[PDB]
PDB file of all heavy atoms in Angstrom:
ATOM      1  N   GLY G   1      -1.451  14.886  -1.611  1.00 17.45           N
ATOM      2  CA  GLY G   1      -0.693  13.619  -2.010  1.00 17.45           C
ATOM      3  C   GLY G   1      -1.070  12.903  -3.262  1.00 17.45           C
ATOM      4  O   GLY G   1      -2.193  12.981  -3.720  1.00 17.45           O
ATOM      5  N   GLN G   2      -0.149  12.186  -3.846  1.00 15.83           N
ATOM      6  CA  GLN G   2      -0.466  11.445  -5.100  1.00 15.83           C
ATOM      7  C   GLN G   2      -1.474  10.336  -4.794  1.00 15.83           C
ATOM      8  O   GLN G   2      -1.129   9.304  -4.252  1.00 15.83           O
ATOM      9  CB  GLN G   2       0.815  10.828  -5.666  1.00 15.83           C
ATOM     10  CG  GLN G   2       1.854  11.927  -5.900  1.00 15.83           C
ATOM     11  CD  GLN G   2       3.148  11.303  -6.421  1.00 15.83           C
ATOM     12  OE1 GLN G   2       3.817  11.873  -7.261  1.00 15.83           O
ATOM     13  NE2 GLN G   2       3.535  10.146  -5.956  1.00 15.83           N
ATOM     14  N   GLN G   3      -2.718  10.539  -5.133  1.00 18.31           N
ATOM     15  CA  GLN G   3      -3.749   9.496  -4.860  1.00 18.31           C
ATOM     16  C   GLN G   3      -3.520   8.290  -5.772  1.00 18.31           C
ATOM     17  O   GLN G   3      -3.028   8.411  -6.873  1.00 18.31           O
ATOM     18  CB  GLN G   3      -5.149  10.064  -5.097  1.00 18.31           C
ATOM     19  CG  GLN G   3      -5.255  10.613  -6.523  1.00 18.31           C
ATOM     20  CD  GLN G   3      -6.608  11.302  -6.706  1.00 18.31           C
ATOM     21  OE1 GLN G   3      -7.588  10.913  -6.101  1.00 18.31           O
ATOM     22  NE2 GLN G   3      -6.706  12.316  -7.521  1.00 18.31           N
ATOM     23  N   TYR G   4      -3.858   7.127  -5.299  1.00 18.01           N
ATOM     24  CA  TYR G   4      -3.662   5.879  -6.086  1.00 18.01           C
ATOM     25  C   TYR G   4      -4.537   5.927  -7.363  1.00 18.01           C
ATOM     26  O   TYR G   4      -5.739   6.060  -7.279  1.00 18.01           O
ATOM     27  CB  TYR G   4      -4.061   4.676  -5.188  1.00 18.01           C
ATOM     28  CG  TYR G   4      -3.762   4.998  -3.732  1.00 18.01           C
ATOM     29  CD1 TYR G   4      -4.778   5.482  -2.893  1.00 18.01           C
ATOM     30  CD2 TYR G   4      -2.464   4.838  -3.233  1.00 18.01           C
ATOM     31  CE1 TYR G   4      -4.496   5.800  -1.562  1.00 18.01           C
ATOM     32  CE2 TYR G   4      -2.184   5.153  -1.897  1.00 18.01           C
ATOM     33  CZ  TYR G   4      -3.200   5.635  -1.062  1.00 18.01           C
ATOM     34  OH  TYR G   4      -2.922   5.949   0.253  1.00 18.01           O
ATOM     35  N   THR G   5      -3.936   5.838  -8.543  1.00 15.85           N
ATOM     36  CA  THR G   5      -4.732   5.898  -9.834  1.00 15.85           C
ATOM     37  C   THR G   5      -4.587   4.604 -10.648  1.00 15.85           C
ATOM     38  O   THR G   5      -5.461   4.240 -11.410  1.00 15.85           O
ATOM     39  CB  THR G   5      -4.188   7.045 -10.692  1.00 15.85           C
ATOM     40  OG1 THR G   5      -2.959   6.643 -11.282  1.00 15.85           O
ATOM     41  CG2 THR G   5      -3.949   8.286  -9.828  1.00 15.85           C
ATOM     42  N   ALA G   6      -3.489   3.916 -10.503  1.00 11.79           N
ATOM     43  CA  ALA G   6      -3.259   2.645 -11.273  1.00 11.79           C
ATOM     44  C   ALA G   6      -3.653   1.477 -10.393  1.00 11.79           C
ATOM     45  O   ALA G   6      -4.507   0.677 -10.720  1.00 11.79           O
ATOM     46  CB  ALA G   6      -1.766   2.519 -11.594  1.00 11.79           C
ATOM     47  N   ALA G   7      -2.999   1.417  -9.271  1.00 11.78           N
ATOM     48  CA  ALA G   7      -3.212   0.367  -8.234  1.00 11.78           C
ATOM     49  C   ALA G   7      -4.590  -0.273  -8.304  1.00 11.78           C
ATOM     50  O   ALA G   7      -4.737  -1.467  -8.146  1.00 11.78           O
ATOM     51  N   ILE G   8      -5.596   0.520  -8.494  1.00 12.28           N
ATOM     52  CA  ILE G   8      -6.979  -0.013  -8.515  1.00 12.28           C
ATOM     53  C   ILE G   8      -7.824   0.831  -9.483  1.00 12.28           C
ATOM     54  O   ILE G   8      -7.882   2.038  -9.405  1.00 12.28           O
ATOM     55  CB  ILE G   8      -7.538   0.013  -7.056  1.00 12.28           C
ATOM     56  CG1 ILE G   8      -6.882   1.134  -6.213  1.00 12.28           C
ATOM     57  CG2 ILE G   8      -7.225  -1.309  -6.333  1.00 12.28           C
ATOM     58  CD1 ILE G   8      -7.111   2.514  -6.832  1.00 12.28           C
ATOM     59  N   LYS G   9      -8.455   0.184 -10.425  1.00 12.35           N
ATOM     60  CA  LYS G   9      -9.292   0.891 -11.440  1.00 12.35           C
ATOM     61  C   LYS G   9     -10.776   0.789 -11.069  1.00 12.35           C
ATOM     62  O   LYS G   9     -11.300  -0.283 -10.840  1.00 12.35           O
ATOM     63  CB  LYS G   9      -9.073   0.246 -12.816  1.00 12.35           C
ATOM     64  CG  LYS G   9      -9.798   1.063 -13.890  1.00 12.35           C
ATOM     65  CD  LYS G   9      -9.449   0.513 -15.275  1.00 12.35           C
ATOM     66  CE  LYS G   9     -10.118   1.371 -16.349  1.00 12.35           C
ATOM     67  NZ  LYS G   9      -9.676   2.788 -16.203  1.00 12.35           N
ATOM     68  N   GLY G  10     -11.464   1.905 -11.036  1.00 11.40           N
ATOM     69  CA  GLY G  10     -12.929   1.903 -10.713  1.00 11.40           C
ATOM     70  C   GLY G  10     -13.162   1.974  -9.199  1.00 11.40           C
ATOM     71  O   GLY G  10     -14.230   2.351  -8.757  1.00 11.40           O
ATOM     72  N   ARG G  11     -12.179   1.623  -8.397  1.00  9.91           N
ATOM     73  CA  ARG G  11     -12.342   1.675  -6.897  1.00  9.91           C
ATOM     74  C   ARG G  11     -11.123   2.363  -6.285  1.00  9.91           C
ATOM     75  O   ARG G  11     -10.098   1.744  -6.085  1.00  9.91           O
ATOM     76  CB  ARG G  11     -12.432   0.245  -6.333  1.00  9.91           C
ATOM     77  CG  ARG G  11     -13.669  -0.504  -6.889  1.00  9.91           C
ATOM     78  CD  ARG G  11     -14.947  -0.105  -6.132  1.00  9.91           C
ATOM     79  NE  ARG G  11     -14.768  -0.363  -4.670  1.00  9.91           N
ATOM     80  CZ  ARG G  11     -15.600   0.150  -3.799  1.00  9.91           C
ATOM     81  NH1 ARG G  11     -16.592   0.898  -4.200  1.00  9.91           N
ATOM     82  NH2 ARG G  11     -15.437  -0.086  -2.525  1.00  9.91           N
ATOM     83  N   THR G  12     -11.227   3.640  -5.975  1.00 12.24           N
ATOM     84  CA  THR G  12     -10.088   4.387  -5.364  1.00 12.24           C
ATOM     85  C   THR G  12     -10.302   4.482  -3.851  1.00 12.24           C
ATOM     86  O   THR G  12     -11.391   4.279  -3.351  1.00 12.24           O
ATOM     87  CB  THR G  12      -9.974   5.797  -6.013  1.00 12.24           C
ATOM     88  OG1 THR G  12     -11.065   5.987  -6.900  1.00 12.24           O
ATOM     89  CG2 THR G  12      -8.655   5.927  -6.803  1.00 12.24           C
ATOM     90  N   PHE G  13      -9.244   4.759  -3.128  1.00 15.22           N
ATOM     91  CA  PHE G  13      -9.311   4.844  -1.636  1.00 15.22           C
ATOM     92  C   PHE G  13      -8.902   6.242  -1.167  1.00 15.22           C
ATOM     93  O   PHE G  13      -7.896   6.780  -1.583  1.00 15.22           O
ATOM     94  CB  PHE G  13      -8.326   3.819  -1.064  1.00 15.22           C
ATOM     95  CG  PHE G  13      -8.818   2.416  -1.379  1.00 15.22           C
ATOM     96  CD1 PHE G  13      -8.752   1.925  -2.691  1.00 15.22           C
ATOM     97  CD2 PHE G  13      -9.343   1.607  -0.361  1.00 15.22           C
ATOM     98  CE1 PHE G  13      -9.209   0.637  -2.977  1.00 15.22           C
ATOM     99  CE2 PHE G  13      -9.798   0.323  -0.652  1.00 15.22           C
ATOM    100  CZ  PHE G  13      -9.733  -0.160  -1.958  1.00 15.22           C
ATOM    101  N   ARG G  14      -9.663   6.817  -0.271  1.00 19.56           N
ATOM    102  CA  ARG G  14      -9.315   8.168   0.273  1.00 19.56           C
ATOM    103  C   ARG G  14      -8.418   7.953   1.489  1.00 19.56           C
ATOM    104  O   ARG G  14      -7.451   8.659   1.700  1.00 19.56           O
ATOM    105  CB  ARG G  14     -10.595   8.906   0.698  1.00 19.56           C
ATOM    106  CG  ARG G  14     -10.255  10.332   1.146  1.00 19.56           C
ATOM    107  CD  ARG G  14     -11.542  11.060   1.541  1.00 19.56           C
ATOM    108  NE  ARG G  14     -11.205  12.430   2.035  1.00 19.56           N
ATOM    109  CZ  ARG G  14     -12.140  13.336   2.164  1.00 19.56           C
ATOM    110  NH1 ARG G  14     -13.379  13.050   1.862  1.00 19.56           N
ATOM    111  NH2 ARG G  14     -11.836  14.529   2.596  1.00 19.56           N
ATOM    112  N   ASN G  15      -8.734   6.953   2.278  1.00 17.56           N
ATOM    113  CA  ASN G  15      -7.922   6.614   3.494  1.00 17.56           C
ATOM    114  C   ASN G  15      -7.122   5.349   3.197  1.00 17.56           C
ATOM    115  O   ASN G  15      -7.669   4.333   2.813  1.00 17.56           O
ATOM    116  CB  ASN G  15      -8.844   6.363   4.716  1.00 17.56           C
ATOM    117  CG  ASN G  15     -10.241   5.923   4.259  1.00 17.56           C
ATOM    118  OD1 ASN G  15     -10.862   6.574   3.443  1.00 17.56           O
ATOM    119  ND2 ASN G  15     -10.767   4.844   4.765  1.00 17.56           N
ATOM    120  N   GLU G  16      -5.835   5.398   3.384  1.00 19.45           N
ATOM    121  CA  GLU G  16      -5.016   4.192   3.123  1.00 19.45           C
ATOM    122  C   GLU G  16      -5.388   3.113   4.136  1.00 19.45           C
ATOM    123  O   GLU G  16      -5.165   1.942   3.918  1.00 19.45           O
ATOM    124  CB  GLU G  16      -3.529   4.533   3.242  1.00 19.45           C
ATOM    125  CG  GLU G  16      -2.691   3.323   2.827  1.00 19.45           C
ATOM    126  CD  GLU G  16      -1.210   3.707   2.816  1.00 19.45           C
ATOM    127  OE1 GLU G  16      -0.897   4.770   2.302  1.00 19.45           O
ATOM    128  OE2 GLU G  16      -0.413   2.934   3.322  1.00 19.45           O
ATOM    129  N   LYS G  17      -5.963   3.499   5.241  1.00 17.47           N
ATOM    130  CA  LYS G  17      -6.360   2.506   6.261  1.00 17.47           C
ATOM    131  C   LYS G  17      -7.316   1.489   5.634  1.00 17.47           C
ATOM    132  O   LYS G  17      -7.181   0.297   5.822  1.00 17.47           O
ATOM    133  CB  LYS G  17      -7.054   3.231   7.412  1.00 17.47           C
ATOM    134  CG  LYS G  17      -7.489   2.221   8.485  1.00 17.47           C
ATOM    135  CD  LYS G  17      -7.940   2.959   9.756  1.00 17.47           C
ATOM    136  CE  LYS G  17      -9.029   3.997   9.422  1.00 17.47           C
ATOM    137  NZ  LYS G  17      -8.384   5.247   8.928  1.00 17.47           N
ATOM    138  N   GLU G  18      -8.288   1.953   4.890  1.00 14.85           N
ATOM    139  CA  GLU G  18      -9.252   1.023   4.256  1.00 14.85           C
ATOM    140  C   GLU G  18      -8.557   0.235   3.146  1.00 14.85           C
ATOM    141  O   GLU G  18      -8.853  -0.920   2.920  1.00 14.85           O
ATOM    142  CB  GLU G  18     -10.422   1.826   3.683  1.00 14.85           C
ATOM    143  CG  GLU G  18     -11.473   0.872   3.120  1.00 14.85           C
ATOM    144  CD  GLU G  18     -12.710   1.664   2.691  1.00 14.85           C
ATOM    145  OE1 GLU G  18     -12.541   2.688   2.050  1.00 14.85           O
ATOM    146  OE2 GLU G  18     -13.805   1.233   3.012  1.00 14.85           O
ATOM    147  N   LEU G  19      -7.632   0.842   2.455  1.00 15.87           N
ATOM    148  CA  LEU G  19      -6.919   0.111   1.368  1.00 15.87           C
ATOM    149  C   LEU G  19      -6.042  -0.965   2.003  1.00 15.87           C
ATOM    150  O   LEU G  19      -5.883  -2.030   1.460  1.00 15.87           O
ATOM    151  CB  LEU G  19      -6.078   1.113   0.560  1.00 15.87           C
ATOM    152  CG  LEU G  19      -5.154   0.434  -0.472  1.00 15.87           C
ATOM    153  CD1 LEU G  19      -5.958  -0.156  -1.639  1.00 15.87           C
ATOM    154  CD2 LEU G  19      -4.173   1.476  -1.028  1.00 15.87           C
ATOM    155  N   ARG G  20      -5.482  -0.702   3.154  1.00 13.58           N
ATOM    156  CA  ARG G  20      -4.631  -1.728   3.822  1.00 13.58           C
ATOM    157  C   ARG G  20      -5.489  -2.958   4.100  1.00 13.58           C
ATOM    158  O   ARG G  20      -5.052  -4.087   3.990  1.00 13.58           O
ATOM    159  CB  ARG G  20      -4.097  -1.163   5.145  1.00 13.58           C
ATOM    160  CG  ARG G  20      -3.123  -2.158   5.785  1.00 13.58           C
ATOM    161  CD  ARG G  20      -2.550  -1.554   7.067  1.00 13.58           C
ATOM    162  NE  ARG G  20      -1.537  -2.488   7.643  1.00 13.58           N
ATOM    163  CZ  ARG G  20      -0.710  -2.078   8.573  1.00 13.58           C
ATOM    164  NH1 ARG G  20      -0.764  -0.846   9.004  1.00 13.58           N
ATOM    165  NH2 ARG G  20       0.170  -2.904   9.070  1.00 13.58           N
ATOM    166  N   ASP G  21      -6.715  -2.728   4.459  1.00 13.95           N
ATOM    167  CA  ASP G  21      -7.650  -3.840   4.753  1.00 13.95           C
ATOM    168  C   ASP G  21      -8.085  -4.497   3.445  1.00 13.95           C
ATOM    169  O   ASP G  21      -7.995  -5.695   3.277  1.00 13.95           O
ATOM    170  CB  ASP G  21      -8.874  -3.299   5.501  1.00 13.95           C
ATOM    171  CG  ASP G  21      -9.834  -4.450   5.813  1.00 13.95           C
ATOM    172  OD1 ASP G  21      -9.353  -5.524   6.135  1.00 13.95           O
ATOM    173  OD2 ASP G  21     -11.031  -4.237   5.725  1.00 13.95           O
ATOM    174  N   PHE G  22      -8.564  -3.724   2.511  1.00 12.88           N
ATOM    175  CA  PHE G  22      -9.004  -4.316   1.224  1.00 12.88           C
ATOM    176  C   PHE G  22      -7.801  -5.004   0.576  1.00 12.88           C
ATOM    177  O   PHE G  22      -7.938  -5.935  -0.191  1.00 12.88           O
ATOM    178  CB  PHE G  22      -9.553  -3.208   0.299  1.00 12.88           C
ATOM    179  CG  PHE G  22     -11.036  -2.962   0.557  1.00 12.88           C
ATOM    180  CD1 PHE G  22     -11.517  -2.867   1.869  1.00 12.88           C
ATOM    181  CD2 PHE G  22     -11.930  -2.823  -0.521  1.00 12.88           C
ATOM    182  CE1 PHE G  22     -12.875  -2.637   2.104  1.00 12.88           C
ATOM    183  CE2 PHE G  22     -13.284  -2.593  -0.282  1.00 12.88           C
ATOM    184  CZ  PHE G  22     -13.760  -2.500   1.030  1.00 12.88           C
ATOM    185  N   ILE G  23      -6.626  -4.559   0.899  1.00 13.80           N
ATOM    186  CA  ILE G  23      -5.410  -5.189   0.331  1.00 13.80           C
ATOM    187  C   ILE G  23      -5.361  -6.612   0.866  1.00 13.80           C
ATOM    188  O   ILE G  23      -5.020  -7.548   0.170  1.00 13.80           O
ATOM    189  CB  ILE G  23      -4.168  -4.357   0.768  1.00 13.80           C
ATOM    190  CG1 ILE G  23      -3.844  -3.318  -0.334  1.00 13.80           C
ATOM    191  CG2 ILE G  23      -2.944  -5.259   1.020  1.00 13.80           C
ATOM    192  CD1 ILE G  23      -2.716  -2.379   0.100  1.00 13.80           C
ATOM    193  N   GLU G  24      -5.714  -6.769   2.102  1.00 14.13           N
ATOM    194  CA  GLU G  24      -5.702  -8.130   2.699  1.00 14.13           C
ATOM    195  C   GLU G  24      -6.687  -9.006   1.920  1.00 14.13           C
ATOM    196  O   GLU G  24      -6.541 -10.208   1.844  1.00 14.13           O
ATOM    197  CB  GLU G  24      -6.094  -8.093   4.185  1.00 14.13           C
ATOM    198  CG  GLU G  24      -4.988  -7.417   5.003  1.00 14.13           C
ATOM    199  CD  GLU G  24      -5.361  -7.450   6.487  1.00 14.13           C
ATOM    200  OE1 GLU G  24      -6.489  -7.110   6.802  1.00 14.13           O
ATOM    201  OE2 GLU G  24      -4.511  -7.816   7.282  1.00 14.13           O
ATOM    202  N   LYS G  25      -7.691  -8.400   1.331  1.00 18.20           N
ATOM    203  CA  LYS G  25      -8.690  -9.188   0.544  1.00 18.20           C
ATOM    204  C   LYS G  25      -8.082  -9.580  -0.810  1.00 18.20           C
ATOM    205  O   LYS G  25      -8.167 -10.721  -1.224  1.00 18.20           O
ATOM    206  CB  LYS G  25      -9.950  -8.339   0.320  1.00 18.20           C
ATOM    207  CG  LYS G  25     -11.064  -9.198  -0.293  1.00 18.20           C
ATOM    208  CD  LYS G  25     -12.289  -8.321  -0.567  1.00 18.20           C
ATOM    209  CE  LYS G  25     -13.351  -9.142  -1.300  1.00 18.20           C
ATOM    210  NZ  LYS G  25     -13.569 -10.429  -0.582  1.00 18.20           N
ATOM    211  N   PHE G  26      -7.465  -8.655  -1.508  1.00 19.36           N
ATOM    212  CA  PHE G  26      -6.859  -9.010  -2.828  1.00 19.36           C
ATOM    213  C   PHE G  26      -5.810 -10.110  -2.612  1.00 19.36           C
ATOM    214  O   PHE G  26      -5.816 -11.124  -3.281  1.00 19.36           O
ATOM    215  CB  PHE G  26      -6.192  -7.773  -3.479  1.00 19.36           C
ATOM    216  CG  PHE G  26      -7.067  -6.522  -3.366  1.00 19.36           C
ATOM    217  CD1 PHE G  26      -6.456  -5.265  -3.187  1.00 19.36           C
ATOM    218  CD2 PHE G  26      -8.471  -6.598  -3.453  1.00 19.36           C
ATOM    219  CE1 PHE G  26      -7.236  -4.104  -3.093  1.00 19.36           C
ATOM    220  CE2 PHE G  26      -9.244  -5.434  -3.363  1.00 19.36           C
ATOM    221  CZ  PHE G  26      -8.629  -4.190  -3.182  1.00 19.36           C
ATOM    222  N   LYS G  27      -4.914  -9.923  -1.678  1.00 19.89           N
ATOM    223  CA  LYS G  27      -3.877 -10.964  -1.419  1.00 19.89           C
ATOM    224  C   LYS G  27      -4.550 -12.182  -0.776  1.00 19.89           C
ATOM    225  O   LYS G  27      -4.762 -12.227   0.419  1.00 19.89           O
ATOM    226  CB  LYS G  27      -2.806 -10.393  -0.469  1.00 19.89           C
ATOM    227  CG  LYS G  27      -1.843  -9.474  -1.243  1.00 19.89           C
ATOM    228  CD  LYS G  27      -0.940  -8.711  -0.255  1.00 19.89           C
ATOM    229  CE  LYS G  27       0.244  -8.072  -1.006  1.00 19.89           C
ATOM    230  NZ  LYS G  27      -0.207  -7.495  -2.286  1.00 19.89           N
ATOM    231  N   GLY G  28      -4.888 -13.168  -1.562  1.00 19.39           N
ATOM    232  CA  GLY G  28      -5.548 -14.379  -0.998  1.00 19.39           C
ATOM    233  C   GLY G  28      -5.910 -15.337  -2.133  1.00 19.39           C
ATOM    234  O   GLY G  28      -7.067 -15.608  -2.384  1.00 19.39           O
ATOM    235  N   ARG G  29      -4.928 -15.851  -2.824  1.00 14.67           N
ATOM    236  CA  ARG G  29      -5.215 -16.790  -3.945  1.00 14.67           C
ATOM    237  C   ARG G  29      -3.909 -17.437  -4.414  1.00 14.67           C
ATOM    238  O   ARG G  29      -3.981 -18.411  -5.145  1.00 14.67           O
ATOM    239  CB  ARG G  29      -5.856 -16.022  -5.107  1.00 14.67           C
ATOM    240  CG  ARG G  29      -4.991 -14.811  -5.471  1.00 14.67           C
ATOM    241  CD  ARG G  29      -5.642 -14.047  -6.625  1.00 14.67           C
ATOM    242  NE  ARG G  29      -5.736 -14.938  -7.819  1.00 14.67           N
ATOM    243  CZ  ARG G  29      -6.497 -14.612  -8.833  1.00 14.67           C
ATOM    244  NH1 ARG G  29      -7.181 -13.500  -8.809  1.00 14.67           N
ATOM    245  NH2 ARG G  29      -6.572 -15.400  -9.871  1.00 14.67           N
TER     246      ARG G  29
END
């Protein structure tokens, strides 16, 4: 699969499950 390359620079995710959670962290401002 097309792994996320833009979405996040310097921190990539292998499991979208963890990105769904870290996403909850970015969305908060």
Side-chain angles (χ1 to χ4, degrees):
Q2 303 178 143
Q3 56 186 329
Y4 329 97
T5 76
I8 28 59
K9 187 174 183 58
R11 298 280 304 166
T12 5
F13 293 72
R14 185 179 178 166
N15 25 308
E16 186 175 315
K17 180 169 54 278
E18 184 174 45
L19 172 71
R20 185 177 184 166
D21 180 38
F22 273 45
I23 266 174
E24 291 183 313
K25 189 183 175 50
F26 316 145
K27 282 170 166 41
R29 52 180 299 166

